[PDB]
Design an enzyme around this catalytic site. Structure first.
Site, PDB file in Angstrom:
ATOM      1  N   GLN A  57      13.164  25.091   1.032  1.00 19.71           N
ATOM      2  CA  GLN A  57      12.587  26.205   0.289  1.00 19.71           C
ATOM      3  C   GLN A  57      11.444  26.793   1.077  1.00 19.71           C
ATOM      4  O   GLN A  57      10.576  26.066   1.533  1.00 19.71           O
ATOM      5  CB  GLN A  57      12.082  25.765  -1.094  1.00 19.71           C
TER       6      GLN A  57
ATOM      7  N   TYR B 225       3.949  48.486   8.924  1.00 18.69           N
ATOM      8  CA  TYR B 225       2.873  49.266   9.491  1.00 18.69           C
ATOM      9  C   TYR B 225       1.929  49.662   8.376  1.00 18.69           C
ATOM     10  O   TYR B 225       2.373  50.082   7.301  1.00 18.69           O
ATOM     11  CB  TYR B 225       3.473  50.497  10.167  1.00 18.69           C
TER      12      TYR B 225
ATOM     13  N   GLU C 245      13.604  52.128  25.816  1.00 20.05           N
ATOM     14  CA  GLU C 245      12.935  52.159  24.515  1.00 20.05           C
ATOM     15  C   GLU C 245      13.721  52.899  23.434  1.00 20.05           C
ATOM     16  O   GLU C 245      13.850  52.396  22.315  1.00 20.05           O
ATOM     17  CB  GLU C 245      11.565  52.799  24.643  1.00 20.05           C
TER      18      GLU C 245
ATOM     19  N   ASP D 167      16.026  54.497   7.017  1.00 18.31           N
ATOM     20  CA  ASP D 167      15.464  55.754   7.415  1.00 18.31           C
ATOM     21  C   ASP D 167      15.537  55.887   8.934  1.00 18.31           C
ATOM     22  O   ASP D 167      16.048  54.992   9.626  1.00 18.31           O
ATOM     23  CB  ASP D 167      14.013  55.853   6.927  1.00 18.31           C
TER      24      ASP D 167
ATOM     25  N   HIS E 133      16.516  45.024  23.204  1.00 16.97           N
ATOM     26  CA  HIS E 133      16.020  44.873  24.560  1.00 16.97           C
ATOM     27  C   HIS E 133      16.846  43.844  25.338  1.00 16.97           C
ATOM     28  O   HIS E 133      17.103  44.015  26.551  1.00 16.97           O
ATOM     29  CB  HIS E 133      14.521  44.524  24.571  1.00 16.97           C
TER      30      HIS E 133
ATOM     31  N   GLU F 115       8.120  51.233   9.750  1.00 11.82           N
ATOM     32  CA  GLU F 115       7.454  51.591   8.480  1.00 11.82           C
ATOM     33  C   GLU F 115       7.207  50.425   7.517  1.00 11.82           C
ATOM     34  O   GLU F 115       6.265  50.467   6.732  1.00 11.82           O
ATOM     35  CB  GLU F 115       8.233  52.708   7.758  1.00 11.82           C
TER      36      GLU F 115
ATOM     37  N   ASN G  43      16.704  50.652   1.937  1.00  8.42           N
ATOM     38  CA  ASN G  43      15.724  51.704   2.231  1.00  8.42           C
ATOM     39  C   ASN G  43      15.815  52.225   3.657  1.00  8.42           C
ATOM     40  O   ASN G  43      14.780  52.310   4.326  1.00  8.42           O
ATOM     41  CB  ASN G  43      14.286  51.163   2.072  1.00  8.42           C
TER      42      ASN G  43
END
Ligand SMILES: O=C(O)C[C@H](NC(=O)OCc1ccccc1)C(=O)O
Ligand SMILES: COC(=O)[C@@H](N)Cc1ccccc1
Ligand SMILES: COC(=O)[C@@H](N)Cc1ccccc1
Ligand SMILES: [Ca+2]
Ligand SMILES: [Ca+2]
Ligand SMILES: [Ca+2]
Ligand SMILES: [Ca+2]
Ligand SMILES: [Zn+2]
Length: 316
Positions: free
Chosen positions: A61, A193, A166, A185, A146, A190, A183
């Site tokens: 756990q 951050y 990159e 995008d 990468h 995001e 979610n």
């Protein structure tokens, strides 16, 4: 570890509960035997010695605050593996099921993540600029990508080849995020951050200029910082990729979107067949045009849209 494959449960950095593949032998280890030659997650214990200790837990756990970055590094490495296997028929980063290793709790206050040539590494952030960086699936997939690049095109991490390196990581980090379908995008990082600021990110594919990055070759950074702008000029390619997928009119040039699956197919093929360690942006355009031609035919809309997208960002 030689043990028995198990399934533990825990909570990630953002407080979400998920199951994780573990291995039991006295302790439960963050060792996923279900994917290739394994996914392995390590505790760097706030130091910079790598990899640290294979993550051991007494009860399978993983709900402690300290566990959260490990849960997400482990889980999102698995999702990324599944993306490359199911979508591109690629077995791990080397195409031969190489073990995937990650370390969390790297250093103190470390607002970064990286691929060190052998494994992925995640800081915890300082709690202001970042929270623990494995909380972002796009971050995890950016880093594993990468490894994929290093084994395939081998784009040198400087100047235009480096900005392509990159952009490839941002592109596939985003496509993995869409694959997982929570979610999703066209923004990068995001989820981890600036926990104090809503709706922002480190980079944007849809509008690189939002965070100061160029969205046209005329605006490319030509100086010496950041290895000749590898995280800056990536914006030009990220914008082209966004346009190829979603469409738009940018600097007066109209692009008909062909969707994210075809974007991934075109760029995966360019990366694995046509790009080289010294490819520049113009050569990326040629590689992408050739890959789209191979997949869809020279008179196709897909090829037309790849050309329009590179025109829109000023890359001939
Ligand atoms: O400094 C470096 O070269 C490592 C750099 N890492 C980095 O920027 O860490 C944070 C982050 C990573 C991916 C997506 C959003 C945020 C990189 O991977 O390119
Ligand atoms: C000088 O770089 C900066 O201040 C960064 N914040 C990048 C940026 C530039 C312009 C607009 C928005 C963001
Ligand atoms: C702090 O890094 C940044 O804000 C990045 N957007 C890179 C950049 C720096 C300065 C100007 C333009 C772009
Ligand atoms: Ca436990
Ligand atoms: Ca997202
Ligand atoms: Ca994202
Ligand atoms: Ca934020
Ligand atoms: Zn990167």
């Amino acid at each position: 570890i030689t043990g028995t494959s198990t399934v533990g449960v825990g909570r990630g950095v953002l407080g979400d509960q998920k199951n994780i593949n573990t291995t039991y032998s006295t302790y439960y280890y963050l060792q996923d035997n279900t994917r290739g030659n394994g996914i392995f997650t390590y505790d760097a214990k706030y130091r910079t010695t790598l990899p640290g200790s294979l993550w051991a837990d007494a009860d399978n756990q993983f709900f402690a605050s300290y566990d959260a970055p490990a849960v997400d590094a482990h889980y999102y490495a698995g999702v990324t593996y599944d993306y490359y296997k199911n979508v591109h028929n690629r077995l791990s980063y080397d195409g031969n099921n190489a073990a995937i290793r990650s370390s969390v709790h790297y250093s103190q206050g470390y607002n970064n993540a990286f691929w060190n040539g052998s494994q992925m590494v995640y800081g915890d952030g300082d709690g202001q600029t970042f929270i623990p960086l494995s909380g972002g699936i796009d971050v995890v997939a950016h880093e594993l990508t990468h490894a994929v690049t290093d084994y395939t095109a081998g784009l040198i991490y400087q100047n235009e080849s480096g900005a392509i390196n990159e952009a490839i990581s941002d592109i596939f980090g985003t496509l993995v995020e869409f694959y997982a379908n929570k979610n999703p995008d066209w923004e990068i990082g995001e989820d981890v951050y600036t926990p104090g600021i809503s709706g922002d990110s480190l980079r944007s594919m849809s509008d690189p200029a939002k965070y100061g990055d160029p969205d046209h070759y005329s605006k490319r950074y030509t100086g010496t910082q950041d290895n000749g702008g590898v995280h800056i000029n990536s914006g030009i390619i990220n914008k082209a990729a966004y346009l190829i997928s979603q469409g738009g009119t940018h600097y007066g040039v109209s692009v008909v979107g062909i969707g994210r699956d075809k974007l991934g197919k075109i760029f995966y093929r360019a990366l694995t067949q046509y790009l080289t360690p010294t490819s520049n942006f113009s050569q990326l355009r040629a590689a992408a045009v050739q890959s789209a031609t191979d997949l869809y035919g020279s008179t196709s809309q897909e090829v037309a849209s790849v050309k329009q997208a590179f025109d829109a960002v000023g890359v001939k």
